[PDB]
Design a protein around this nucleic acid. Sequence first.
DNA 1: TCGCCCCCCTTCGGTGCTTTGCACCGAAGGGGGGC
Lengths: 553, 406
Amino acid sequence: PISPIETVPVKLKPGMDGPKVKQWPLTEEKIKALVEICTEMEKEGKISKIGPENPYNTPVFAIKKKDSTKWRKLVDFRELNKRTQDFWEVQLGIPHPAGLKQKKSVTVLDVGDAFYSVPLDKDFRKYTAFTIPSINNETPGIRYQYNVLPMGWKGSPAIFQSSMTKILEPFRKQNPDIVIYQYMDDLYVGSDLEIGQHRTKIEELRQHLLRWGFTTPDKKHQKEPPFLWMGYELHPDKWTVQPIVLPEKDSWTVNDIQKLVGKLNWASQIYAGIKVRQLSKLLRGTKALTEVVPLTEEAELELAENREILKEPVHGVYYDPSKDLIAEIQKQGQGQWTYQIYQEPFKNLKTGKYARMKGAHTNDVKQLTEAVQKIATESIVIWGKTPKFKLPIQKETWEAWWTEYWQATWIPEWEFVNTPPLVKLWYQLEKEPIIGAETFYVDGAANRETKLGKAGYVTDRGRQKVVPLTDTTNQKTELQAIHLALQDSGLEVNIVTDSQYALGIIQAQPDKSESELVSQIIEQLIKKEKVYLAWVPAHKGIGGNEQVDKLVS
Amino acid sequence: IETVPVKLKPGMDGPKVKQWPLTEEKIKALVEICTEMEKEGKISKIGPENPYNTPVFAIKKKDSTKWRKLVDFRELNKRTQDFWEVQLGIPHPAGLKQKKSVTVLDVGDAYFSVPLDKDFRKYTAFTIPSINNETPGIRYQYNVLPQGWKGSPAIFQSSMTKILEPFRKQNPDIVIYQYMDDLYVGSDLEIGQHRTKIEELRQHLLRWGGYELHPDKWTVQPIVLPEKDSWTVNDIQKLVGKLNWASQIYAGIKVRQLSKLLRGTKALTEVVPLTEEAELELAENREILKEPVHGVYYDPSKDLIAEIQKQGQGQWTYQIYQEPFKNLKTGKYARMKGAHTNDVKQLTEAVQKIATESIVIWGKTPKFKLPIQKETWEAWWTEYWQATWIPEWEFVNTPPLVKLWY
DNA sequence: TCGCCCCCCTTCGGTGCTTTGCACCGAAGGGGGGC
Ligand SMILES: Nc1nc2c(ncn2[C@H]2C[C@H](O)[C@@H](COP(=O)(O)OP(=O)(O)OP(=O)(O)O)O2)c(=O)[nH]1
Ligand SMILES: [Mg+2]
């Protein structure tokens, strides 16, 4: 059936015309699949024959469906899509089973031939011209245009989703206590009605859809748990992901490792503790998807750990609105974080991970804040509220961060949880100079065109140092100057630089960095006992700074 | 009534900004609000063939415990034609900042009585999200002058003038300034007598269709220098670097007779006595910083910029300027919510207060340089926003070399 | 030999700074998953 719903008017972009692209050759098994779909499609009014008056064409092909025996007709509308107007996509995200509530009665339905049940704007149909080849040599193919949404057109998903929403709107407003999760053409229908009354509403819903041209074949009508939905399995009390099969390989290509990492990210939504840092490192600096990449020892260990986790069966539970959401985060090392979201203990709604490296220089407290922000956003999306946090950072540590740090920062309601390793500041800078400690006037400079530079210091106790540097930058030399003072100084030291840059980095208390040189300084700062760091303007003859600026000349 | 033709600026297209996630209660409010607006014809449901979008969310003021829909048309406004080019926009009375009490009124609803150019409506599209993406987003566009669109006060200008003429004629010494959806209403009446005239104005409005500011007490905050009895080398290295920076703002500031004091590679905690020429140089620089800068004048044709530094203890300093180092106003915002403990809330409130001061003083909001990570700001700021307008902002990571404004 | 959506990890390139590299950030490459 073709929905009698109104067509959505659609345009080409201005000045643009339609596609004129030739059909490529196809197998005879695929030609026959298309002929049967097509001759049938013409009989249902899905397509119509066209003639030479229509100058456009676009290639067509066919893949198999997971309905193992059926075929999916696809058109390579890449060219038409470029010239088709932009759309505002109404699919804003993906529903998650952790956001579902426990329902007494559940049904999953899928609309048959969804796209082909929605008509296409009549003025636009001529641009969908295609041809079925039929073994190529003997005849010029038979030509058609679409009268309904094609699979492969940029606008078809949103127009279908919009049309489905309109069709469902009357039923939703008449049945506010029936949850309908509407994903493309797949309908999850939950209710707290008794099965008999529930199945009455289903029939009603299915009859309503049929009036609007949307069939609901029995083969796709799930009545009993476990329900297969969005790649999960819904039981009455719990849900699981459909099985995740990790690649097994003696020799790994770049593309294999990319596939493996993607699987593990997908698994991390319910399998706690997944890590992909070391496997993902292997993709750095590679140059082809087929380049063999040997697994490092750290990647093998990480893979082994992840396999042990994937071997243990897991399940998430459903959302209880009358209870608090609780998010708990653990630190895993090397900028990796994992979290669990629960309401009752040891009954996870879902898990996840945060491992992005934001910035060249950062610290654990910042990255914890980022994890918090990721979880908060995810929680708004799934449950419409943020959770209570349990974090492995002392209240004292946080208070020390957001008072000495110059940017506004914050975490919502959170509770300390002693789960080592704890998040902490790895050093602190004295806000007052330190009596008795040596004073270092540091400076470094490089010749902008030459690559050469000097780093050095002079000291109140009388010490003196210059270091030649090759292939550097202006900013590096300053960092080297700081590098030296920390290196040649006792556990207590006072330092004076004229690089707003270096002050900026170090004063942010980083504990990791993409720069090997900044990492060294971090190393040295952690070993120290007290450090006061101070700045002065360059080239204004200040005592100490001028002595060193001279010396580095 | 007949619509006013409206265009985007030449060579620009409409806004294409994604909807961000919303809490349950904000989605509920918006569904309720947009449903009612739909019935009343103020908005129409649209589909995805309209390629434009503008984020929508909802605020709720503590002293008005109902929700207020807020469409962030900042992008659409930047792309909308100017009505200064087309001679429809509003002027700023210089007397508003002279008043002892200024009350802010939300008159957004007056716009909903005027239809919008039907060729322009598509640019006003917005999308209500769905909890756990249960459904696709639901899209509307405006049929009437939208709240938050800069063309609304311009098109409704003549209407607003006629509504207010009797009140402004009956109260010559009250000053009313329209900024977007708001009326800024100032007088010199005793507080309780001010609030009664506000209630009167509210009544005159309802026969067609906040809390009190005090520009009296918006003191400027200067650059001060520490006073002590003993001075170390570090005290004077910090005094010199500070004054050197300040010599980009003020005129004839001198560092030569204080830097001399430091000559030599000296210990930071070494107590160095002031000379009499350093005391002269210091007390002199002190006074230049005391009374304000000669030669700084507002230019209405240029944008305002606001910088903010976190200073701790719930304190926040700020500068408003249009040209670097030519500050039109320096200040210090202090919170009192109660706990002491939410930086993002304090910064969000500091931003509304600073922007509120620019409207009262100059008639428009500044572009903010915010000392916060973009993602930290975006995780939380809507929870604390209470204004019907939103200022332009950008995000800056600025280590303090000097604690210049403290 | 297709489309649209969310996610993560890597890479690339435009922007603006009282710079001469550097940090930031959005976009696009790869991958996972959905229909
Ligand atoms: N362009 C494109 N669209 C797809 C693809 N898979 C699914 N869709 C779109 C088009 C489908 O009509 C719609 C529903 O997915 P289905 O798997 O249920 O296919 P359909 O309903 O058309 O046939 P069915 O009777 O359910 O087997 O989602 C794809 O691989 N490429
Ligand atoms: Mg289907």
